[PDB]
Amino acid sequence: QILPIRFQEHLQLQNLGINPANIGFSTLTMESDKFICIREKVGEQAQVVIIDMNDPSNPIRRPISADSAIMNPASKVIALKAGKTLQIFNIEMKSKMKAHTMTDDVTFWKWISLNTVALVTDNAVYHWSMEGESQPVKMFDRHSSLAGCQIINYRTDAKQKWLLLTGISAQQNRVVGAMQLYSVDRKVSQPIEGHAASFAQFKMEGNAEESTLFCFAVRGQAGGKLHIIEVGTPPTGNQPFPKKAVDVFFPPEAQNDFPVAMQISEKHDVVFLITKYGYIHLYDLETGTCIYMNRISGETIFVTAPHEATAGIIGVNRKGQVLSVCVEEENIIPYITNVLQNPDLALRMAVRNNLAGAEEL
Amino acid sequence: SRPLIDLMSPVVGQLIDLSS
Numbered sequence: 001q002i003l004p005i006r007f008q009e010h011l012q013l014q015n016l017g018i019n020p021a022n023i024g025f026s027t028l029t030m031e032s033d034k035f036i037c038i039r040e041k042v043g044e045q046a047q048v049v050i051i052d053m054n055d056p057s058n059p060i061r062r063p064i065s066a067d068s069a070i071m072n073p074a075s076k077v078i079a080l081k082a083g084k085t086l087q088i089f090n091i092e093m094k095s096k097m098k099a100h101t102m103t104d105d106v107t108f109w110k111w112i113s114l115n116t117v118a119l120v121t122d123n124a125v126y127h128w129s130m131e132g133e134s135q136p137v138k139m140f141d142r143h144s145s146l147a148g149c150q151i152i153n154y155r156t157d158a159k160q161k162w163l164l165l166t167g168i169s170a171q172q173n174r175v176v177g178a179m180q181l182y183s184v185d186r187k188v189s190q191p192i193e194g195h196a197a198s199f200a201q202f203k204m205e206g207n208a209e210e211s212t213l214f215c216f217a218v219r220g221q222a223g224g225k226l227h228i229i230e231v232g233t234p235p236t237g238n239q240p241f242p243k244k245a246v247d248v249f250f251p252p253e254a255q256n257d258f259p260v261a262m263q264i265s266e267k268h269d270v271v272f273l274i275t276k277y278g279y280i281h282l283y284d285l286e287t288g289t290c291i292y293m294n295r296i297s298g299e300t301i302f303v304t305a306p307h308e309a310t311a312g313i314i315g316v317n318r319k320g321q322v323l324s325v326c327v328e329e330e331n332i333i334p335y336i337t338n339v340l341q342n343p344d345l346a347l348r349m350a351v352r353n354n355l356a357g358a359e360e361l
Numbered sequence: 362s363r364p365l366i367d368l369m370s371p372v373v374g375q376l377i378d379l380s381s
Contacts (some may be wrong), residue, residue, distance in 0.1 A: 065363070065365045066365040085365070087364065089365075089366050096364060099362065101362075140371055141371045143371060144370070181377070188373070188376060189372070190375060190377065231377060243378075
């Protein structure tokens with residue numbers, strides 16, 4: 001049978017000498033699809049294992065004194081932190097690029113662009129750009145609802161004027177996500193119950209310029225729900241994006257699941273959603289319509305990234321399989337019109353994203 | 362400051378309305 005998405009296996013890290021207690025959210029980071037960095041405990045010389053994804057047979061192992069190591073999303077430039085000490089290193093030049101010591105402990109950090117690491121302490125969120133002697137500037141202060149939570153994500157939009165911090169707490173058999181959405185233009189935040197999110201740029205039809213869309217999924221309490229909403233005032237000449245709110249189905253076998261990860265393709269205008277028990281969901285970004293729903297992994301996929309070559313999502317599970325799911329481009333429109341029995345959505349995604357299969361009217 | 366590698370409270374308002 002002809003399916004709307006395509007699966008690929010890239011690596012299994014256990015074949016390169018990675019012990020799976022170090023395959024986890026604490027010790028493995030994958031900021032983009034170019035590199036994987038594994039904090040490793042061998043003997044007790046604490047080392048880091050850096051996998052080039054364009055050369056996976058030759059990883060490099062170097063000793064560290066850091067509690068977290070994140071790779072730059074484009075270059076082989078590592079960021080290492082110990083408590084309040086932060087350092088930025090070029091690996092191919094063996095040079096320290098930058099260094100800064102904060103007043104507080106940085107509990108979470110993530111590259112948000114090509115040259116900016118974002119820094120999360122217990123009370124504030126900082127943006128540290130790598131240009132020159134640029135020191136971390138403060139974006140916003142943290143909200144009451146994210147205190148005492150495990151911070152799992154921080155995502156911005158492309159203009160970096162809409163920021164979102166995402167943490168989780170354990171409230172009675174159930175992982176409750178708390179998100180702080182902050183705008184730097186109105187200097188105001190909002191607490192949202194939310195589990196996984198991403199931002200997107202989306203030019204509507206009949207329209208001059210792109211909407212900036214905020215998409216998040218929650219297993220809140222009514223159930224699983226997915227919301228797609230425009231943030232900010234629309235530009236002038238731009239009709240506003242109509243608010244989308246659809247259901248996220250969870251099966252009765254997996255009624256302790258919740259979403260953990262989200263990437264949005266802009267080549268196809270779709271939303272990839274992965275849950276904790278290893279389920280992939282594919283939605284349409286314009287309408288919210290569920291295209292596909294099935295289970296990619298037996299184990300927990302804890303880290304994801306955009307897949308740039310296929311316009312998809314790449315993720316690592318707890319066993320160590322590096323997997324990728326993308327839109328199968330010659331199959332998705334015949335899947336929507338005949339298996340999903342939706343000729344209208346198949347017509348719309350064939351005109352909007354230049355997909356084949358628009359000769360069956 | 363030795364190298365970490367060896368190579369050798371806010372304003373709350375409504376930004377978005379989520380009620381359909």
